[PDB]
Amino acid sequence: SLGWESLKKLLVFTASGVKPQGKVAAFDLDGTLITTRSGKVFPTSPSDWRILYPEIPKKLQELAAEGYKLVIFTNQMGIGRGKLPAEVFKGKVEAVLEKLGVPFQVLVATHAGLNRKPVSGMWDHLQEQANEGIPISVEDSVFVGDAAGRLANWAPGRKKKDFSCADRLFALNVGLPFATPEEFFLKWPAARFELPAFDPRTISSAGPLYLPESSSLLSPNPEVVVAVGFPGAGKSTFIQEHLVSAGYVHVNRDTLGSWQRCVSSCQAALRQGKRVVIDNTNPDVPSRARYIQCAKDAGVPCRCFNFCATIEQARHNNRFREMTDPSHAPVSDMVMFSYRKQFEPPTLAEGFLEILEIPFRLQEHLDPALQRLYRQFSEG
């Protein structure tokens, strides 16, 4: 009866009969509680749904009787993208809930960002805003979903691995016990699965800023520093904080128009006794050679600062910044993949006096809240 609440990037439905509880049985929607009636991969209309397994309502009745608050957590980015009308999705949800026959609270992530599984925004909303202030025991709760990162063929008729691991990673981020729909409703044996190679729980603020520690970030005399690394991974921030703040001239090629004005800019800075930093995407030998030649012509050293971030680390950082930094320029996946395809590690043979390695590390001076968010998986 309480009904729908609309927030900027979240919809919440609370059915008649919902009660706050200290334990929750939460569920994905698409491919977990429902599937297409049509038997197609994608629904042909808002009415193209059926309950996934006939075992489902009995299990839900049993959970409700044991005092579990029933909740749905669903990503519906089609709403934010303008492809799926919110008011049509709302109707579909009410129809599904009527068929399931038990009171549910539903939370819908309409956009990318904090609320989009696997990020735990919807859980935090449930706990902080939508459970009448009752603390929820995560250990006594459960999340059930089909985006579980399962390997192909976990059952007759599925030569296709799970498209996503977002449901399993949501549970991991929150600390919730997790099960697939088949393990949960049908008591099938656990299916084999894979986690992402990069685990953001492993990202430290520890260790040296750069290697070798015996080297110095700055030179007293003119030089050209060439920064190498994936975009959106913190290169420019590091350069701003450590070099530009020390008076290095930020020479940006993308905005100088042509090679000629760039080289001229570089040369004028050097002639003035200044140090120069190139903060661009310089993934391969030919990209970097231009700047090395400029240094050589000017008779100044060229050093490389090689930022260690991997593609998945960089993409993680990008998403984090999208979620937390109003000034962040979102780096597209195409830019990331193009960089990786072109990447050749810097070597001294290119003409560098030395190469410093800049380990991928958590930034200092993120507040505690942001650090907790940083360690969450943010893509399934």
Ligand SMILES: [Cl-]
């Ligand atoms: Cl989802």
Ligand SMILES: [Cl-]
């Ligand atoms: Cl979605």
Ligand SMILES: [Cl-]
């Ligand atoms: Cl688990």
Ligand SMILES: [Cl-]
């Ligand atoms: Cl200077």
Ligand SMILES: [Mg+2]
């Ligand atoms: Mg699903």
